[PDB]
């Protein structure tokens, strides 16, 4: 195997959440924002190199939605078994005091694709400059997701990636500090 | 979180696997209900096959449609090879050089011992080899690697540590081999 | 008209 390109989609009830995305060797090329009906490129340059008509993704999602309901009944209404996430927090480069860096919260091997993630600095939520990915596919059919927090290293700051998922009995908090 | 109502999930995946560029291409289409893969279309098989009893109805219905079966059989060219070519220049050919630094761990649990750290980051693709040397002789023991970490942003990192008992004069070298560079990258730490 | 990624269409299931 030299490379793998995967067109992955899903529809989830009763949340009525759908997703359409392409990835290359585990990295997302793009996904379609269902609300804004538009292709969202993982790296900005991709959209200057290629294109994707979002409408077609919506078409597929509609079919996925109709097939889920069909499959829900065909299975004698069998629900999914929640698999809680494995969470880790790392910086993307070695940390140097007062040198801009980025904290990455890796949320892995969980299902269904619904999760609540919050970055905490010394216990209080931080939303400044944060970002995140949509749900990425896995060979075992569970999901991956990443959250990011740019920050300025300090000897005084303590950070936590707070994660809630139906497979967890309480919020999971993974901390990191210089 | 609240809302413990039962959830029902459906996934549709089309995997295009490429070997030696596009000389060998395989399309693996798979349907997954919750966590169970129920039906698939493997280009190496030519038709839909039920993985579990749940998918039998779809395999039958889908295999009944001849035009669908034909487009699927030619997908390896109209879909897989097509998309592979669309991004070949900025994906398969993407190459970002690692940034390598060596430093002693800020946490040393043992006197007379020095846990050395080789940080390798911001690289792409993920294929890489990191080795430690002591006076130019490869250290095959006492090495701890965090493993390959995919950052989610088309970039990778990896951390490789070396357990050492340093004696003055020794030269420790972290060597990195990656497709982005022609000759190994080396960074040394002197005892 | 930059090269376009092409999708494979989802097939409708029977009951």
Q: Which residues pair with A172 in a beta bridge?
A: A163
Q: Which residues contact A29 (CB under 8 A, 6 or more apart)?
A: A5, A21, A22, A23, A41, A42, A46, B87, B91, C5
Given A57, A79, A101, the domain boundary residue is A79
Q: Do residues A52 and A20 touch, judged by C-beta distance below 8 A?
A: no
Indicate if A93 and A47 belong to the same structural domain. Answer: no
Q: Is the CB of C7 less than 8 angstroms away from the CB of A66?
A: no
Which residues of chain C are within 8 Å of residue A22 when distances are taken between CB atoms? 5
Residue A69, classified by CB atoms within 10 Å of its CB into exposed (0-12), middle (13-18) or buried (19+), is middle
User: How many angstroms away from the CA of B13 is the closest CA of chain C?
Assistant: 10
Distance (Å, rounded) from C-alpha A165 to C-alpha A148? 18
Is B94 annotated to bind a ligand? Reply is yes
CA distances from C7 to A58, B54, B80, B125, B172 (A): 11, 25, 10, 25, 51
Query: Measured between alpha carbons, how far apart are the two ends of chain A, in Å?
Result: 39
Indicate if B71 and B101 belong to the same structural domain. Answer: no
Indicate if B6 and B89 belong to the same structural domain. Answer: yes
CA distances from A107 to B1, B35, B106, C14 (A): 17, 18, 27, 35
Unique residue bearing structure tokens 């200057």: A48
What does the DSSP 8-state code read for residue A44?
T
C4, C6, C8, C10: which to substitute to probe chain A, counting the most A Cβ within 10 Å? C10
Phi-psi region of A26 (alpha: psi -120 to 50; beta: other; left: phi over 0): left
User: How many angstroms away from the CA of A77 is the closest CA of chain C?
Assistant: 14
Indicate if B171 and B89 belong to the same structural domain. Answer: no
Residue A35, classified by CB atoms within 10 Å of its CB into exposed (0-12), middle (13-18) or buried (19+), is exposed
Measured from the Cβ of residue B160, the count of other Cβ atoms closer than 10 Å reads: 20
Residue of A nearest to C14 (CA): A70
Residue of B nearest to C11 (CA): B62
Q: Is the CB of B91 less than 8 angstroms away from the CB of A74?
A: no
Write the residue in C2, C9, C12 that is nearest to A50 by C-beta: C2
The CATH number that applies at residue B162 is: 2.60.40.10
Is B82 annotated to bind a ligand? Reply is yes
CA distances from A50 to A133, A163, B77 (A): 20, 35, 18
Indicate if B99 and B88 belong to the same structural domain. Answer: no
Indicate if A129 and A73 belong to the same structural domain. Answer: no
B81 by DSSP, 3-state: which? Answer: helix
B49 by DSSP, 3-state: which? Answer: strand
- The DSSP annotation for B7-43 comes to -EEEEEEEEEEEETTTTEEEEEEEEEETTEEEEEEET
Q: Which residues pair with A160 in a beta bridge?
A: A120, A175
Phi-psi region of A141 (alpha: psi -120 to 50; beta: other; left: phi over 0): left
Q: Domains in chain B: how many in total?
A: 2
Distance (Å, rounded) from C-alpha B71 to C-alpha B65? 10
Distance (Å, rounded) from C-alpha B57 to C-alpha A75? 12
Distance (Å, rounded) from C-alpha B34 to C-alpha B16? 22
Q: How was this structure determined?
A: X-ray
C2, C4, C8: which to substitute to probe chain B, counting the most B Cβ within 10 Å? C8
Q: Which residues contact A57 (CB under 8 A, 6 or more apart)?
A: A9, A20, A32, A39, C7
CA distances from A60 to A21, A57, A134, B54 (A): 11, 5, 18, 21
Given B93, B109, B144, the domain boundary residue is B93
Q: Is the CB of B1 less than 8 angstroms away from the CB of A166?
A: yes
Given B71, B93, B115, the domain boundary residue is B93
Indicate if A75 and A129 belong to the same structural domain. Answer: no
What does the DSSP 8-state code read for residue B77?
I
Domain housing A59? 1-79
Q: Domains in chain A: how many in total?
A: 2
Write the residue in C4, C8, C13 that is nearest to B14 by C-beta: C8
Query: Measured between alpha carbons, how far apart are the two ends of chain C, in Å?
Result: 39
**How many CA atoms, within 13 angstroms, populate the side-chain half-sphere of residue A136?**
24
CA distances from B76 to A25, A103, A107, B46, B83 (A): 18, 39, 33, 11, 10
Domain housing B36? 1-93
Run of H or E residues at B82:
helix B82-87
- Tokens representing residue A15 in the block: 């949340």
Given B33, B67, B93, the domain boundary residue is B93
A42 near B CB under 8 A: yes
**CA neighbor of A8 nearest in space, from B29, C6, B14:** B14
């Amino acid at each position: 195997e030299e490379h793998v390109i995967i067109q992955a989609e899903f529809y989830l009830n009763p949340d009525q959440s759908g997703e359409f995305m392409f990835d290359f060797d585990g990295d997302e090329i793009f996904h379609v924002d269902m609300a804004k009906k538009e292709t969202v490129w993982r790296l900005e340059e991709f959209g200057r190199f290629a294109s994707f008509e979002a409408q077609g993704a919506l078409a597929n999602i509609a079919v996925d939605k109709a097939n889920l309901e069909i499959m829900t009944k065909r299975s004698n209404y069998t629900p999914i078994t929640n698999v809680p996430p494995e969470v880790t927090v790392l910086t993307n480069s070695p940390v140097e005091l007062r040198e801009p860096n980025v904290l990455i919260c890796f949320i892995d091997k969980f299902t269904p694709p619904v999760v609540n993630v919050t970055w905490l600095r010394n216990g209080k939520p931080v939303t400044t400059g944060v970002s995140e990915t949509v749900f990425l596919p896995r060979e075992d059919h569970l999901f991956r997701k990443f959250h990011y927090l740019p920050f300025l290293p300090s000897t005084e700051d303590v950070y936590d990636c707070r994660v809630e998922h139906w497979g967890l009995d309480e919020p999971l908090l993974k901390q990191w500090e210089f | 979180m609240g809302d413990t109502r039962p959830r029902f999930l459906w996934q549709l995946k089309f995997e295009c696997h490429f070997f030696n560029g596009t000389e060998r291409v395989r399309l693996l289409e798979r349907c997954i209900y919750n966590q169970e893969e129920s039906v698939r279309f493997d280009s190496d098989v030519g038709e839909y096959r039920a993985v579990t009893e749940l998918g039998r109805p779809d395999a039958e219905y889908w295999n009944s449609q001849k035009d669908l079966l034909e487009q699927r059989r030619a997908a390896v060219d109209t879909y897989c090879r097509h998309n592979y070519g669309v991004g070949e220049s900025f994906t398969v050919q993407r190459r970002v050089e690692p940034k390598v630094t060596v430093y002693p761990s800020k946490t040393q649990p043992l006197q007379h011992h020095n846990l050395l750290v080789c940080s390798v980051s911001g690289f792409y693709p993920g294929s890489i080899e990191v080795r430690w040397f002591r006076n130019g002789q490869e250290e095959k023991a006492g090495v701890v690697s965090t493993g390959l970490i995919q950052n989610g942003d088309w970039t990778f990192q990896t951390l490789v540590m070396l357990e050492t008992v340093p004696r003055s004069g020794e030269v420790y070298t972290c060597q990195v081999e990656h497709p982005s560079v022609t000759s190994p990258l080396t960074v040394e730490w002197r005892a | 008209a930059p090269p376009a990624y092409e999708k494979l269409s989802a097939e409708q299931s029977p009951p």
